[PDB]
Amino acid sequence: RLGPYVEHLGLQFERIDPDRAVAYWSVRADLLQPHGILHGGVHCAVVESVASAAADRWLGDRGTVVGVSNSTDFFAPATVADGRLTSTALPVHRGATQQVWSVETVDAAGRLVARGQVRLHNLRL
Amino acid sequence: RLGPYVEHLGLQFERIDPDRAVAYWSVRADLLQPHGILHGGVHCAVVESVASAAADRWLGDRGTVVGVSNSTDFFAPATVADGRLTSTALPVHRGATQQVWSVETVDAAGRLVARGQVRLHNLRL
Amino acid sequence: RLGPYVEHLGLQFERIDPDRAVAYWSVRADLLQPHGILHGGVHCAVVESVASAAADRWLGDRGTVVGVSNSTDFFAPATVADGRLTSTALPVHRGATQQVWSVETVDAAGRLVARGQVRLHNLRL
Amino acid sequence: RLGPYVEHLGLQFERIDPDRAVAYWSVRADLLQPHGILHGGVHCAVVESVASAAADRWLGDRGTVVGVSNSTDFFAPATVADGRLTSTALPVHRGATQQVWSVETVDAAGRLVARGQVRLHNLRL
Numbered sequence: 001r002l003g004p005y006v007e008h009l010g011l012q013f014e015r016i017d018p019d020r021a022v023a024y025w026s027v028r029a030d031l032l033q034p035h036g037i038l039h040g041g042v043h044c045a046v047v048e049s050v051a052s053a054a055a056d057r058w059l060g061d062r063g064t065v066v067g068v069s070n071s072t073d074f075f076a077p078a079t080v081a082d083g084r085l086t087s088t089a090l091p092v093h094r095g096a097t098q099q100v101w102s103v104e105t106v107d108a109a110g111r112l113v114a115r116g117q118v119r120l121h122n123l124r125l
Numbered sequence: 126r127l128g129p130y131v132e133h134l135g136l137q138f139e140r141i142d143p144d145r146a147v148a149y150w151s152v153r154a155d156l157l158q159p160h161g162i163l164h165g166g167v168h169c170a171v172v173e174s175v176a177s178a179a180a181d182r183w184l185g186d187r188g189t190v191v192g193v194s195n196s197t198d199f200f201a202p203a204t205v206a207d208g209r210l211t212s213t214a215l216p217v218h219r220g221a222t223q224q225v226w227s228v229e230t231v232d233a234a235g236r237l238v239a240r241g242q243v244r245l246h247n248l249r250l
Numbered sequence: 251r252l253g254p255y256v257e258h259l260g261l262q263f264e265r266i267d268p269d270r271a272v273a274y275w276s277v278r279a280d281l282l283q284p285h286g287i288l289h290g291g292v293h294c295a296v297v298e299s300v301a302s303a304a305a306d307r308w309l310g311d312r313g314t315v316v317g318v319s320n321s322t323d324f325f326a327p328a329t330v331a332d333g334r335l336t337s338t339a340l341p342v343h344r345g346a347t348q349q350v351w352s353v354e355t356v357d358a359a360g361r362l363v364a365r366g367q368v369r370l371h372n373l374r375l
Numbered sequence: 376r377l378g379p380y381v382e383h384l385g386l387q388f389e390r391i392d393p394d395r396a397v398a399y400w401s402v403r404a405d406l407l408q409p410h411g412i413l414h415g416g417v418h419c420a421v422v423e424s425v426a427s428a429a430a431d432r433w434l435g436d437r438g439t440v441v442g443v444s445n446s447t448d449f450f451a452p453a454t455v456a457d458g459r460l461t462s463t464a465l466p467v468h469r470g471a472t473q474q475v476w477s478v479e480t481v482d483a484a485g486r487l488v489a490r491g492q493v494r495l496h497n498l499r500l
């Protein structure tokens with residue numbers, strides 16, 4: 001129940017709690033930019049996906065969230081050879097009107113591949 | 126020659142110059158998050174695509190660019206009903222090692238839907 | 251009527267309109283970091299000052315603004331030798347609850363020294 | 376040995392290690408914006424100060440660092456009444472050419488007042 005774009009990214013969630021979300025995924029040939037590494041927009045969309053899932057789960061029955069902004073840094077190039085990536089969203093602030101979550105994407109060795117912050121607005125019932 | 130992820134986004138470039146890139150696209154049902162609006166990661170990936178295309182074209186035969194970071198703000202929700210979006214990348218700084226580009230995504234009425242900055246690193250021959 | 255920190259920065263405003271603010275200032279020895287160039291935080295505070303002044307002026311009698319976030323890029327080192335800097339704030343979005351402004355700091359030659367975006371929240375009467 | 380602007384901020388460092396820096400400070404009347412809360416630029420400058428100190432200490436004899444960009448979020452208003460703030464810088468990435476550090480400013484109760492990321496460039500000998 002995360003939408004069609006999340007499915008196309010290939011994210012597979014191990015956990016979506018009010019205080020953490022974890023998802024596994026992989027570089028795929030269709031996700032590349034012309035020099036054979038991951039298109040940077042894919043990192044941003046993964047960061048957006050894992051944070052908004054957690055933010056939505058935290059808000060729960062009390063309303064719904066809308067994305068406000070996303071700032072993602074790319075620290076290493078990623079290819080199909082780099083295997084399974086893990087993206088973990090952790091909360092920075094969870095308040096009445098705003099949420100900010102931090103998402104780290106790491107490889108199996110724990111090497112930080114990307115890291116992003118997502119700001120969300122709470123639409124409360 | 127922009128890679129498979131750019132094609133999947135549906136971007137169609139009117140212009141890729143050393144100082145500006147313009148691309149048209151549209152919200153599509155496969156690009157949505159669960160509440161029927163555009164997945165925010167799609168805005169980030171579009172911003173990344175149009176800026177990196179321009180940055181790569183500016184660097185030209187002198188080398189190649191790698192994405193460093195992307196910060197995109199979402200100002201209005203976007204649906205299939207909102208029609209054709211236009212994303213324009215304009216340069217902020219184009220130097221020896223770094224480039225920063227600003228990308229605005231607007232609807233046909235000129236309403237600002239999203240806006241992002243992309244930092245790139247120059248890999249020079 | 252901009253507060254004591256703005257005065258300590260040495261900002262001198264030529265213009266504070268609902269759609270633009272302009273201020274002149276200069277690197278000073280007390281504003282430096284240990285290697286003799288401008289402390290980067292000074293760029294951020296100048297960006298915050300010129301944008302919030304404009305945002306507050308735009309909101310006018312209808313309420314007041316509070317800073318939400320600030321993202322500033324530093325493109326060139328600045329010293330006392332670099333003379334008079336000009337910081338211009340231009341609006342990106344001015345809505346019901348949020349404002350986003352973009353501020354460019356340039357030297358006399360038009361060389362871009364720094365550039366920042368400031369997000370503000372509208373506290374409406 | 377941190378420069379005159381750091382002194383004017385009133386930062387007092389408990390720790391500057393290659394992997395963490397901690398500094399205490401306080402809102403002061405001269406640091407305010409016109410509505411009696413901390414000028415947001417002060418948060419950015421504190422974030423810049425504590426991260427660059429740590430980054431410089433990590434690089435050590437091998438070279439020196441220059442600020443590249445700073446993104447700070449303000450989560451609560453801060454006044455003189457809020458007492459002693461603690462700013463802690465932790466490393467996100469420390470590589471050959473780039474460093475990224477994350478800085479959290481909290482009050483005595485552990486309430487998150489501000490949080491910023493600083494990107495630095497390594498000038499290596």
Ligand SMILES: Cc1cccc2c(C(=O)O)cccc12
Binds near residue numbers: 177
């Ligand atoms: C053409 C090109 C070069 C370098 C990078 C890119 C990216 C990217 O930054 O991920 C995305 C799309 C196209 C790119």
Ligand SMILES: Cc1cccc2c(C(=O)O)cccc12
Binds near residue numbers: 001002158160
């Ligand atoms: C589940 C959910 C709620 C609200 C927003 C989202 C987004 C988004 O922020 O675009 C992306 C993916 C899932 C979302």
Ligand SMILES: Cc1cccc2c(C(=O)O)cccc12
Binds near residue numbers: 378381427431
């Ligand atoms: C010690 C040091 C080195 C390099 C940079 C700095 C900065 C700065 O980034 O402006 C601020 C404060 C201290 C610094």
Ligand SMILES: Cc1cccc2c(C(=O)O)cccc12
Binds near residue numbers: 253298299415
């Ligand atoms: C005039 C005004 C209103 C609201 C906020 C500010 C700030 C600030 O954003 O900290 C800085 C300088 C002036 C301000």
